[PDB]
Amino acid sequence: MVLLHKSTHIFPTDFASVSRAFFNRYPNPYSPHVLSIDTISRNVDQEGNLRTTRLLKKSGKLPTWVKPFLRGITETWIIEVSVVNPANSTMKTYTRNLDHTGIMKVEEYTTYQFDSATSSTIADSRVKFSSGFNMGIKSKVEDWSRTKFDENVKKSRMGMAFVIQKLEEA
Amino acid sequence: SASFAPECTDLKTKYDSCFNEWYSEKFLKGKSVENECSKQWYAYTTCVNAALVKQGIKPALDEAREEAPFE
């Protein structure tokens, strides 16, 4: 079983503000379940780009019906990979859960892109929910996925909004 | 902002601070590519990897680190 969702947001801000905010996303009031975040590797590659790999721990609560079948999981590790191209004002981000992969795998691609004409930063997101080990009828899995996608669209966009405002407020 | 291993948190902050200044003033202005934050990074990353060795998540991470999703 596979589900894909696409969203798009326009930050009316410059690439520097938006990217610096991405790296400084946490903590923020829209992401209380995020317990930690650590930078695993970071370096400049041969084309001038900044490659970052970060590691997040996030708490969660499964929906109740699933609970007997599972398997007592609260927390999840998430890997975050990113490339910053300063000559194009382009940032590419990819996240995914590191664990509970066999149950449910949730990948996200977000592209931040500065559009000089509109003086704004376009962020396009694609989120991929993959699940073999179906366990339960998909519709609840599909609904669970719709609910989580919609919740993280608002959470990430409000969280980024917030962080950008407060970083400029200095 | 906390590290998964609390005893690393303070080494993280000082790394982050430094990088925050390097990123905004040097990197995006196209001035610098140099890792001006050498020792903050080294201290931090040392602490964090020592913390990681005791962690079950670490082989998943080591395998994940060798994927290049923007392929």
Side-chain angles (χ1 to χ4, degrees), chain A residues 16 19-20 23-24 26-27 35-42 44 48 50-51 55 77 79 81 83-84 86 92-94 96 98 109, chain B residues 1-5 12 15-16 19-24 27-28 33 35 41 44-45 48 52 55 57 60-61 63-65 67 69-70:
Chain A
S19 63
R20 178 181 168 85
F23 286 123
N24 281 279
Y26 308 114
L35 306 176
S36 82
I37 172 145
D38 288 283
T39 306
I40 300 317
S41 57
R42 173 172 277 156
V44 188
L50 179 67
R51 306 275 230 171
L55 177 59
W77 295 84
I79 192 167
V81 183
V83 184
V84 171
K92 279 170 172 185
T93 62
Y94 169 80
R96 83 170 171 92
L98 279 176
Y109 292 83
Chain B
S1 183
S3 171
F4 75 85
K12 190 176 84 90
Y15 168 69
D16 292 346
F19 166 79
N20 274 341
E21 199 78 345
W22 167 89
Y23 181 70
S24 294
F27 183 70
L28 292 183
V33 280
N35 186 336
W41 170 252
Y44 171 47
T45 197
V48 143
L52 264 183
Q55 299 294 323
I57 198 39
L61 173 63
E63 158 196 67
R65 285 179 76 180
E67 328 170 302
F70 318 116

Short mmCIF file of all heavy atoms in Angstrom, two decimals, chain A residues 16 19-20 23-24 26-27 35-42 44 48 50-51 55 77 79 81 83-84 86 92-94 96 98 109, chain B residues 1-5 12 15-16 19-24 27-28 33 35 41 44-45 48 52 55 57 60-61 63-65 67 69-70:
data_model
loop_
_atom_site.label_atom_id
_atom_site.label_comp_id
_atom_site.label_asym_id
_atom_site.label_seq_id
_atom_site.Cartn_x
_atom_site.Cartn_y
_atom_site.Cartn_z
N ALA A 16 17.50 33.37 2.86
CA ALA A 16 18.32 33.31 4.07
C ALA A 16 17.44 33.12 5.30
O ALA A 16 17.69 32.22 6.10
CB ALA A 16 19.17 34.55 4.22
N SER A 19 15.76 29.43 5.12
CA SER A 19 16.72 28.37 5.41
C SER A 19 17.23 28.41 6.86
O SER A 19 17.15 27.41 7.59
CB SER A 19 17.90 28.43 4.43
OG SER A 19 18.63 29.64 4.56
N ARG A 20 17.74 29.56 7.30
CA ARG A 20 18.16 29.69 8.70
C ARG A 20 17.06 29.24 9.66
O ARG A 20 17.34 28.70 10.75
CB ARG A 20 18.57 31.12 9.02
CG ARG A 20 18.96 31.31 10.48
CD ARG A 20 19.34 32.75 10.79
NE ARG A 20 19.44 32.96 12.23
CZ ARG A 20 20.53 32.70 12.94
NH1 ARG A 20 21.62 32.26 12.33
NH2 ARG A 20 20.54 32.90 14.25
N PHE A 23 16.88 25.33 9.75
CA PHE A 23 17.87 24.77 10.66
C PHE A 23 17.54 25.07 12.13
O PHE A 23 18.07 24.42 13.02
CB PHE A 23 19.26 25.30 10.33
CG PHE A 23 19.85 24.71 9.10
CD1 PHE A 23 20.26 25.52 8.05
CD2 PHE A 23 20.01 23.33 8.98
CE1 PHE A 23 20.82 24.97 6.91
CE2 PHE A 23 20.56 22.78 7.85
CZ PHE A 23 20.98 23.60 6.81
N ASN A 24 16.69 26.06 12.37
CA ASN A 24 16.38 26.47 13.75
C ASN A 24 14.92 26.26 14.12
O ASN A 24 14.41 26.88 15.06
CB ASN A 24 16.77 27.92 13.95
CG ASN A 24 18.26 28.08 14.17
OD1 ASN A 24 18.76 27.88 15.28
ND2 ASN A 24 18.99 28.40 13.11
N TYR A 26 13.36 24.00 15.81
CA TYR A 26 12.99 23.49 17.13
C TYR A 26 13.82 24.13 18.24
O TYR A 26 14.98 24.51 18.03
CB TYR A 26 13.09 21.94 17.14
CG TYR A 26 12.31 21.34 15.99
CD1 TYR A 26 12.95 20.66 14.96
CD2 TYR A 26 10.94 21.49 15.90
CE1 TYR A 26 12.24 20.12 13.90
CE2 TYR A 26 10.21 20.97 14.83
CZ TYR A 26 10.87 20.28 13.83
OH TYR A 26 10.15 19.77 12.77
N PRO A 27 13.22 24.30 19.42
CA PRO A 27 11.82 23.96 19.67
C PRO A 27 10.89 25.04 19.14
O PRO A 27 11.35 26.15 18.92
CB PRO A 27 11.75 23.89 21.19
CG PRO A 27 12.71 24.95 21.61
CD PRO A 27 13.84 24.93 20.60
N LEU A 35 11.35 15.84 20.75
CA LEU A 35 12.09 15.76 22.00
C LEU A 35 13.53 16.22 21.86
O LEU A 35 14.08 16.82 22.77
CB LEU A 35 12.07 14.33 22.52
CG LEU A 35 10.69 13.72 22.66
CD1 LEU A 35 10.85 12.29 23.10
CD2 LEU A 35 9.86 14.51 23.67
N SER A 36 14.14 15.91 20.73
CA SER A 36 15.51 16.30 20.50
C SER A 36 15.82 16.35 19.02
O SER A 36 15.05 15.88 18.18
CB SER A 36 16.47 15.34 21.18
OG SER A 36 16.67 14.18 20.38
N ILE A 37 16.97 16.92 18.71
CA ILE A 37 17.44 17.00 17.35
C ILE A 37 18.93 17.24 17.42
O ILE A 37 19.40 18.14 18.13
CB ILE A 37 16.75 18.10 16.56
CG1 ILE A 37 17.43 18.27 15.21
CG2 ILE A 37 16.75 19.37 17.37
CD1 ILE A 37 16.48 18.64 14.09
N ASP A 38 19.67 16.43 16.68
CA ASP A 38 21.12 16.43 16.76
C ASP A 38 21.70 16.42 15.36
O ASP A 38 21.14 15.80 14.45
CB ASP A 38 21.61 15.22 17.57
CG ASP A 38 21.32 15.35 19.04
OD1 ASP A 38 22.05 16.10 19.72
OD2 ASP A 38 20.35 14.72 19.52
N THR A 39 22.82 17.11 15.19
CA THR A 39 23.44 17.18 13.88
C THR A 39 24.47 16.07 13.76
O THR A 39 25.45 16.06 14.49
CB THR A 39 24.09 18.57 13.63
OG1 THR A 39 23.11 19.60 13.86
CG2 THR A 39 24.63 18.68 12.22
N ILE A 40 24.23 15.13 12.86
CA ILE A 40 25.08 13.94 12.71
C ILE A 40 26.28 14.26 11.86
O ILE A 40 27.41 13.94 12.22
CB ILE A 40 24.31 12.75 12.06
CG1 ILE A 40 23.10 12.33 12.90
CG2 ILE A 40 25.25 11.58 11.82
CD1 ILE A 40 23.38 12.29 14.40
N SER A 41 26.03 14.85 10.70
CA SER A 41 27.12 15.26 9.83
C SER A 41 26.78 16.56 9.15
O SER A 41 25.61 16.86 8.93
CB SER A 41 27.41 14.20 8.76
OG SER A 41 26.25 13.93 8.00
N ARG A 42 27.81 17.31 8.80
CA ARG A 42 27.63 18.55 8.05
C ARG A 42 28.91 18.91 7.30
O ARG A 42 29.99 18.92 7.88
CB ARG A 42 27.22 19.67 9.00
CG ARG A 42 27.16 21.04 8.37
CD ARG A 42 26.56 22.02 9.34
NE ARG A 42 25.10 21.99 9.34
CZ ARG A 42 24.37 22.37 10.38
NH1 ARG A 42 24.98 22.79 11.48
NH2 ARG A 42 23.05 22.34 10.31
N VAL A 44 30.61 20.94 3.34
CA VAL A 44 30.38 21.57 2.06
C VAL A 44 30.89 20.62 0.98
O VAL A 44 32.01 20.13 1.07
CB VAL A 44 31.07 22.96 1.96
CG1 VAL A 44 30.67 23.67 0.70
CG2 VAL A 44 30.70 23.82 3.15
N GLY A 48 29.79 23.49 -3.89
CA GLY A 48 29.49 24.69 -3.14
C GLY A 48 28.30 24.55 -2.22
O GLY A 48 27.91 25.53 -1.57
N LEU A 50 25.84 23.01 0.95
CA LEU A 50 25.94 22.61 2.33
C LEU A 50 25.06 21.37 2.56
O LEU A 50 23.82 21.45 2.47
CB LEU A 50 25.53 23.75 3.26
CG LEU A 50 25.60 23.38 4.74
CD1 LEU A 50 27.05 23.12 5.24
CD2 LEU A 50 24.90 24.41 5.60
N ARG A 51 25.72 20.24 2.81
CA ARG A 51 25.09 18.94 3.12
C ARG A 51 24.93 18.72 4.61
O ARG A 51 25.94 18.61 5.33
CB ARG A 51 25.92 17.80 2.57
CG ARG A 51 26.22 17.89 1.11
CD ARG A 51 25.09 17.32 0.34
NE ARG A 51 25.57 16.37 -0.65
CZ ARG A 51 24.76 15.58 -1.35
NH1 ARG A 51 23.45 15.65 -1.16
NH2 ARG A 51 25.26 14.73 -2.23
N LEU A 55 19.37 14.24 13.20
CA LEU A 55 18.67 13.11 13.81
C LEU A 55 17.70 13.64 14.85
O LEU A 55 18.10 14.39 15.74
CB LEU A 55 19.67 12.13 14.44
CG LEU A 55 19.16 10.90 15.19
CD1 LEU A 55 18.31 10.00 14.30
CD2 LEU A 55 20.33 10.12 15.75
N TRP A 77 12.52 7.53 15.84
CA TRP A 77 13.65 8.32 15.38
C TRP A 77 13.38 8.73 13.93
O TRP A 77 12.85 7.95 13.14
CB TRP A 77 14.98 7.57 15.48
CG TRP A 77 15.43 7.24 16.88
CD1 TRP A 77 15.04 6.17 17.61
CD2 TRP A 77 16.37 7.96 17.69
NE1 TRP A 77 15.66 6.18 18.83
CE2 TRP A 77 16.48 7.27 18.91
CE3 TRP A 77 17.12 9.12 17.51
CZ2 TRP A 77 17.31 7.70 19.94
CZ3 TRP A 77 17.94 9.55 18.53
CH2 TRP A 77 18.03 8.84 19.73
N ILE A 79 15.30 10.65 10.54
CA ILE A 79 16.49 11.20 9.94
C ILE A 79 16.10 12.35 9.02
O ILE A 79 15.09 12.28 8.30
CB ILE A 79 17.29 10.14 9.16
CG1 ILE A 79 18.68 10.70 8.81
CG2 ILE A 79 16.54 9.67 7.93
CD1 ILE A 79 19.67 9.64 8.32
N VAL A 81 17.73 14.91 6.08
CA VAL A 81 18.86 15.19 5.21
C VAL A 81 18.55 16.47 4.43
O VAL A 81 17.40 16.75 4.12
CB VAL A 81 19.15 13.99 4.28
CG1 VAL A 81 20.35 14.25 3.43
CG2 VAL A 81 19.38 12.75 5.10
N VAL A 83 20.25 19.67 1.58
CA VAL A 83 21.26 20.31 0.76
C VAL A 83 20.91 21.79 0.54
O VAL A 83 19.81 22.10 0.11
CB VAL A 83 21.38 19.63 -0.61
CG1 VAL A 83 22.52 20.25 -1.41
CG2 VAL A 83 21.60 18.18 -0.43
N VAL A 84 21.85 22.68 0.84
CA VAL A 84 21.65 24.11 0.63
C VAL A 84 22.57 24.61 -0.47
O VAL A 84 23.79 24.58 -0.33
CB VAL A 84 21.92 24.95 1.89
CG1 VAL A 84 21.92 26.46 1.55
CG2 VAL A 84 20.90 24.62 2.97
N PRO A 86 23.46 27.87 -2.14
CA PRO A 86 23.49 29.32 -1.94
C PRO A 86 23.59 30.13 -3.25
O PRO A 86 23.30 31.32 -3.24
CB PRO A 86 24.75 29.52 -1.10
CG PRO A 86 25.65 28.41 -1.52
CD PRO A 86 24.75 27.24 -1.78
N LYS A 92 16.96 21.64 -0.45
CA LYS A 92 16.21 20.38 -0.57
C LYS A 92 16.27 19.61 0.73
O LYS A 92 17.35 19.40 1.30
CB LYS A 92 16.78 19.50 -1.69
CG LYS A 92 16.33 19.86 -3.09
CD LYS A 92 17.17 19.05 -4.07
CE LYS A 92 16.69 19.18 -5.49
NZ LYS A 92 17.49 18.26 -6.36
N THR A 93 15.11 19.19 1.21
CA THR A 93 15.03 18.49 2.47
C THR A 93 14.35 17.15 2.26
O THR A 93 13.43 17.04 1.45
CB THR A 93 14.26 19.31 3.51
OG1 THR A 93 12.93 19.50 3.04
CG2 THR A 93 14.91 20.67 3.69
N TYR A 94 14.80 16.14 2.99
CA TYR A 94 14.20 14.81 2.98
C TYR A 94 14.17 14.27 4.40
O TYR A 94 15.20 14.20 5.04
CB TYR A 94 15.00 13.87 2.07
CG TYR A 94 14.62 12.41 2.18
CD1 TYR A 94 13.50 11.91 1.53
CD2 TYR A 94 15.40 11.51 2.92
CE1 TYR A 94 13.16 10.58 1.61
CE2 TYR A 94 15.07 10.16 3.01
CZ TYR A 94 13.94 9.71 2.35
OH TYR A 94 13.58 8.39 2.42
N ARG A 96 12.68 10.97 7.04
CA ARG A 96 11.95 9.69 7.19
C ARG A 96 12.21 9.04 8.56
O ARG A 96 13.28 9.23 9.15
CB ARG A 96 12.33 8.70 6.09
CG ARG A 96 13.60 7.91 6.34
CD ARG A 96 13.76 6.78 5.31
NE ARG A 96 15.07 6.13 5.39
CZ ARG A 96 15.32 5.05 6.14
NH1 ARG A 96 14.35 4.52 6.87
NH2 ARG A 96 16.53 4.51 6.15
N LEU A 98 13.30 6.32 11.08
CA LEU A 98 14.39 5.36 11.00
C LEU A 98 13.94 4.00 11.46
O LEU A 98 14.41 2.98 10.96
CB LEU A 98 15.58 5.83 11.83
CG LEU A 98 16.38 6.85 11.03
CD1 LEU A 98 17.52 7.44 11.83
CD2 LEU A 98 16.88 6.15 9.77
N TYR A 109 9.62 14.86 1.12
CA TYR A 109 10.49 15.74 0.35
C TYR A 109 9.94 17.15 0.37
O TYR A 109 8.81 17.40 -0.05
CB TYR A 109 10.61 15.29 -1.10
CG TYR A 109 11.35 14.00 -1.29
CD1 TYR A 109 10.71 12.77 -1.12
CD2 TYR A 109 12.69 14.00 -1.65
CE1 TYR A 109 11.39 11.59 -1.30
CE2 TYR A 109 13.38 12.82 -1.83
CZ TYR A 109 12.73 11.62 -1.65
OH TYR A 109 13.42 10.45 -1.83
N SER B 1 16.68 24.02 23.03
CA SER B 1 16.68 22.85 22.15
C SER B 1 17.64 21.75 22.63
O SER B 1 18.85 21.94 22.70
CB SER B 1 17.05 23.26 20.73
OG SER B 1 16.98 22.13 19.86
N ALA B 2 17.08 20.58 22.93
CA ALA B 2 17.79 19.51 23.61
C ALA B 2 18.40 18.46 22.69
O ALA B 2 17.89 18.20 21.60
CB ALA B 2 16.87 18.82 24.60
N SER B 3 19.50 17.87 23.16
CA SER B 3 20.15 16.76 22.49
C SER B 3 19.50 15.48 22.99
O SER B 3 18.94 15.47 24.09
CB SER B 3 21.65 16.76 22.79
OG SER B 3 22.27 15.57 22.33
N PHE B 4 19.54 14.40 22.22
CA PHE B 4 18.89 13.19 22.69
C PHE B 4 19.60 12.71 23.96
O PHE B 4 18.96 12.16 24.86
CB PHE B 4 18.85 12.10 21.60
CG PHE B 4 20.16 11.42 21.35
CD1 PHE B 4 20.56 10.34 22.14
CD2 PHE B 4 20.99 11.83 20.32
CE1 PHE B 4 21.76 9.69 21.91
CE2 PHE B 4 22.20 11.19 20.08
CZ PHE B 4 22.58 10.12 20.88
N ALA B 5 20.91 12.96 24.04
CA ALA B 5 21.70 12.73 25.25
C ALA B 5 21.93 14.05 25.96
O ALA B 5 22.74 14.86 25.50
CB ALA B 5 23.03 12.07 24.90
N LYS B 12 26.06 21.16 22.14
CA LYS B 12 25.29 21.37 20.92
C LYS B 12 25.04 22.86 20.71
O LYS B 12 25.29 23.40 19.63
CB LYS B 12 23.96 20.61 20.98
CG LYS B 12 23.21 20.58 19.64
CD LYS B 12 21.94 19.73 19.74
CE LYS B 12 20.78 20.53 20.31
NZ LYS B 12 20.05 21.19 19.19
N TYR B 15 27.95 24.73 19.52
CA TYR B 15 28.19 24.44 18.11
C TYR B 15 27.17 25.26 17.28
O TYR B 15 27.56 26.04 16.39
CB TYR B 15 28.07 22.95 17.77
CG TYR B 15 28.04 22.72 16.27
CD1 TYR B 15 29.17 22.94 15.51
CD2 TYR B 15 26.88 22.31 15.62
CE1 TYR B 15 29.16 22.76 14.14
CE2 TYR B 15 26.86 22.15 14.24
CZ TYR B 15 28.01 22.38 13.51
OH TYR B 15 28.02 22.21 12.13
N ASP B 16 25.88 25.10 17.62
CA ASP B 16 24.79 25.70 16.85
C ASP B 16 24.99 27.23 16.73
O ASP B 16 25.01 27.76 15.62
CB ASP B 16 23.43 25.39 17.48
CG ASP B 16 23.05 23.91 17.40
OD1 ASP B 16 23.67 23.13 16.63
OD2 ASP B 16 22.08 23.52 18.10
N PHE B 19 27.70 28.00 14.31
CA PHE B 19 27.25 27.72 12.95
C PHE B 19 26.18 28.71 12.50
O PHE B 19 26.13 29.10 11.33
CB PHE B 19 26.69 26.29 12.84
CG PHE B 19 25.92 26.04 11.57
CD1 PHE B 19 26.58 25.79 10.38
CD2 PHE B 19 24.54 26.08 11.56
CE1 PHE B 19 25.87 25.57 9.21
CE2 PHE B 19 23.83 25.87 10.41
CZ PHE B 19 24.49 25.62 9.23
N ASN B 20 25.34 29.12 13.44
CA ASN B 20 24.30 30.06 13.09
C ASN B 20 24.95 31.34 12.58
O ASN B 20 24.50 31.92 11.60
CB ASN B 20 23.36 30.32 14.27
CG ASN B 20 22.26 29.30 14.35
OD1 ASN B 20 21.97 28.61 13.37
ND2 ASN B 20 21.64 29.17 15.53
N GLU B 21 26.07 31.73 13.18
CA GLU B 21 26.72 32.96 12.76
C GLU B 21 27.48 32.73 11.46
O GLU B 21 27.63 33.63 10.66
CB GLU B 21 27.66 33.48 13.86
CG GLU B 21 28.03 34.96 13.73
CD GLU B 21 26.92 35.91 14.19
OE1 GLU B 21 25.76 35.46 14.36
OE2 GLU B 21 27.22 37.11 14.39
N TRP B 22 27.92 31.50 11.25
CA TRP B 22 28.79 31.25 10.11
C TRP B 22 27.93 31.15 8.88
O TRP B 22 28.31 31.59 7.80
CB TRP B 22 29.60 29.97 10.30
CG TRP B 22 30.26 29.49 9.06
CD1 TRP B 22 31.49 29.84 8.61
CD2 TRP B 22 29.72 28.58 8.10
NE1 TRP B 22 31.76 29.21 7.42
CE2 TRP B 22 30.68 28.43 7.08
CE3 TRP B 22 28.50 27.89 7.98
CZ2 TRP B 22 30.49 27.60 5.98
CZ3 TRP B 22 28.31 27.06 6.88
CH2 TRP B 22 29.29 26.93 5.89
N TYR B 23 26.76 30.58 9.09
CA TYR B 23 25.84 30.32 8.00
C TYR B 23 25.30 31.63 7.46
O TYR B 23 25.37 31.88 6.26
CB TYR B 23 24.71 29.40 8.49
CG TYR B 23 23.71 29.06 7.43
CD1 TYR B 23 24.05 28.23 6.37
CD2 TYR B 23 22.42 29.57 7.47
CE1 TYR B 23 23.14 27.93 5.38
CE2 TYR B 23 21.50 29.28 6.48
CZ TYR B 23 21.87 28.45 5.43
OH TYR B 23 20.96 28.14 4.44
N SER B 24 24.80 32.49 8.35
CA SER B 24 24.18 33.77 7.98
C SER B 24 25.17 34.81 7.44
O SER B 24 24.90 35.46 6.44
CB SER B 24 23.43 34.38 9.17
OG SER B 24 22.32 33.58 9.54
N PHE B 27 28.44 32.03 4.93
CA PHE B 27 28.13 31.07 3.89
C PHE B 27 27.17 31.59 2.83
O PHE B 27 27.45 31.48 1.64
CB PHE B 27 27.56 29.77 4.47
CG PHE B 27 27.29 28.75 3.43
CD1 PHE B 27 28.34 28.12 2.78
CD2 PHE B 27 26.00 28.44 3.06
CE1 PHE B 27 28.09 27.16 1.80
CE2 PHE B 27 25.74 27.48 2.08
CZ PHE B 27 26.79 26.85 1.45
N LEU B 28 26.03 32.13 3.25
CA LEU B 28 25.05 32.65 2.29
C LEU B 28 25.48 33.97 1.60
O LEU B 28 24.91 34.36 0.57
CB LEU B 28 23.70 32.83 2.97
CG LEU B 28 23.05 31.51 3.37
CD1 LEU B 28 21.68 31.76 3.98
CD2 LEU B 28 22.96 30.59 2.16
N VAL B 33 33.69 29.00 2.89
CA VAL B 33 33.28 27.61 2.92
C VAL B 33 34.01 26.85 4.00
O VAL B 33 33.85 25.67 4.16
CB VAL B 33 33.48 26.94 1.57
CG1 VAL B 33 32.34 27.31 0.67
CG2 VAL B 33 34.76 27.41 0.95
N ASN B 35 35.34 25.57 7.61
CA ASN B 35 34.64 25.12 8.80
C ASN B 35 35.17 25.89 10.00
O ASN B 35 35.99 25.39 10.76
CB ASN B 35 34.84 23.62 9.01
CG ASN B 35 34.02 23.08 10.16
OD1 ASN B 35 33.65 23.81 11.07
ND2 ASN B 35 33.74 21.78 10.13
N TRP B 41 32.41 21.80 16.86
CA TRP B 41 31.90 20.63 16.16
C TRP B 41 32.54 19.36 16.67
O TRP B 41 31.86 18.38 16.88
CB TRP B 41 32.14 20.72 14.66
CG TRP B 41 31.83 19.41 14.02
CD1 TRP B 41 32.72 18.52 13.50
CD2 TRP B 41 30.53 18.80 13.89
NE1 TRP B 41 32.05 17.40 13.03
CE2 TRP B 41 30.71 17.55 13.27
CE3 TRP B 41 29.24 19.21 14.24
CZ2 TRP B 41 29.64 16.70 12.98
CZ3 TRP B 41 28.17 18.36 13.95
CH2 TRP B 41 28.38 17.12 13.33
N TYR B 44 31.36 18.56 20.27
CA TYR B 44 29.98 18.14 20.17
C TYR B 44 29.84 16.74 19.57
O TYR B 44 29.31 15.83 20.21
CB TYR B 44 29.21 19.15 19.35
CG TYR B 44 27.82 18.72 18.99
CD1 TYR B 44 26.98 18.17 19.94
CD2 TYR B 44 27.34 18.90 17.70
CE1 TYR B 44 25.70 17.78 19.61
CE2 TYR B 44 26.05 18.52 17.36
CZ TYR B 44 25.24 17.97 18.32
OH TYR B 44 23.97 17.59 18.00
N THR B 45 30.33 16.57 18.35
CA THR B 45 30.15 15.32 17.62
C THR B 45 30.79 14.14 18.36
O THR B 45 30.28 13.03 18.32
CB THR B 45 30.72 15.45 16.18
OG1 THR B 45 30.20 14.40 15.36
CG2 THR B 45 32.22 15.37 16.17
N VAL B 48 28.33 13.23 21.08
CA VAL B 48 27.12 12.64 20.49
C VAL B 48 27.33 11.24 19.94
O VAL B 48 26.46 10.38 20.11
CB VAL B 48 26.53 13.57 19.36
CG1 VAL B 48 25.97 12.79 18.19
CG2 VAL B 48 25.46 14.42 19.94
N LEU B 52 25.75 7.70 20.91
CA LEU B 52 25.09 6.90 19.88
C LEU B 52 25.47 5.42 19.91
O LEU B 52 24.67 4.57 19.52
CB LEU B 52 25.41 7.45 18.50
CG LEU B 52 24.36 8.38 17.93
CD1 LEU B 52 24.73 8.81 16.52
CD2 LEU B 52 22.99 7.72 17.97
N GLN B 55 23.23 3.07 21.51
CA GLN B 55 21.86 3.20 21.02
C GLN B 55 21.48 2.14 19.99
O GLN B 55 22.22 1.89 19.03
CB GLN B 55 21.64 4.59 20.40
CG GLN B 55 21.84 5.74 21.35
CD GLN B 55 20.80 5.75 22.43
OE1 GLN B 55 19.64 5.42 22.19
NE2 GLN B 55 21.21 6.11 23.64
N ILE B 57 19.25 2.53 17.80
CA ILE B 57 18.90 3.15 16.52
C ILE B 57 20.10 3.25 15.58
O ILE B 57 19.95 3.44 14.37
CB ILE B 57 18.28 4.56 16.71
CG1 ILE B 57 17.54 4.98 15.44
CG2 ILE B 57 19.34 5.59 17.09
CD1 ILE B 57 16.78 3.82 14.77
N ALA B 60 20.46 1.44 12.03
CA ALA B 60 19.49 2.04 11.10
C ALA B 60 19.99 3.37 10.57
O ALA B 60 19.81 3.70 9.40
CB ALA B 60 18.16 2.24 11.78
N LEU B 61 20.60 4.14 11.45
CA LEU B 61 21.13 5.44 11.10
C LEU B 61 22.35 5.31 10.20
O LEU B 61 22.55 6.09 9.28
CB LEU B 61 21.50 6.23 12.36
CG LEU B 61 22.22 7.55 12.12
CD1 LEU B 61 21.33 8.49 11.33
CD2 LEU B 61 22.63 8.17 13.43
N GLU B 63 22.99 2.88 8.23
CA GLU B 63 22.52 2.46 6.92
C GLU B 63 21.84 3.62 6.20
O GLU B 63 21.99 3.79 4.99
CB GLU B 63 21.57 1.28 7.02
CG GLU B 63 20.66 1.15 5.81
CD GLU B 63 19.47 0.24 6.04
OE1 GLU B 63 18.59 0.61 6.85
OE2 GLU B 63 19.42 -0.83 5.41
N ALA B 64 21.10 4.43 6.94
CA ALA B 64 20.37 5.54 6.32
C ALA B 64 21.31 6.60 5.78
O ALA B 64 21.04 7.21 4.75
CB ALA B 64 19.40 6.17 7.30
N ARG B 65 22.42 6.80 6.48
CA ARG B 65 23.42 7.80 6.13
C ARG B 65 24.10 7.52 4.81
O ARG B 65 24.78 8.39 4.28
CB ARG B 65 24.49 7.91 7.21
CG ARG B 65 24.06 8.65 8.46
CD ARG B 65 25.20 8.68 9.47
NE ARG B 65 26.21 9.65 9.08
CZ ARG B 65 27.32 9.91 9.75
NH1 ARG B 65 27.58 9.26 10.88
NH2 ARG B 65 28.16 10.83 9.30
N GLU B 67 22.40 6.33 2.12
CA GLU B 67 21.48 6.61 1.04
C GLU B 67 21.60 8.09 0.64
O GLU B 67 21.85 8.94 1.49
CB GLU B 67 20.05 6.27 1.46
CG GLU B 67 19.98 5.09 2.43
CD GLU B 67 18.60 4.90 3.04
OE1 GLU B 67 18.09 5.84 3.69
OE2 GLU B 67 18.04 3.80 2.89
N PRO B 69 19.12 10.49 -1.05
CA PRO B 69 17.73 10.66 -1.51
C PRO B 69 17.55 11.64 -2.66
O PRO B 69 16.51 11.60 -3.32
CB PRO B 69 17.00 11.15 -0.25
CG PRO B 69 18.07 11.62 0.67
CD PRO B 69 19.28 10.80 0.38
N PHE B 70 18.53 12.52 -2.90
CA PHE B 70 18.44 13.45 -4.03
C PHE B 70 19.19 12.88 -5.23
O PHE B 70 19.78 13.63 -6.01
CB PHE B 70 18.98 14.84 -3.65
CG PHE B 70 18.54 15.30 -2.29
CD1 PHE B 70 19.48 15.51 -1.28
CD2 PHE B 70 17.20 15.51 -2.00
CE1 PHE B 70 19.08 15.90 -0.02
CE2 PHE B 70 16.80 15.92 -0.75
CZ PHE B 70 17.73 16.11 0.25
#
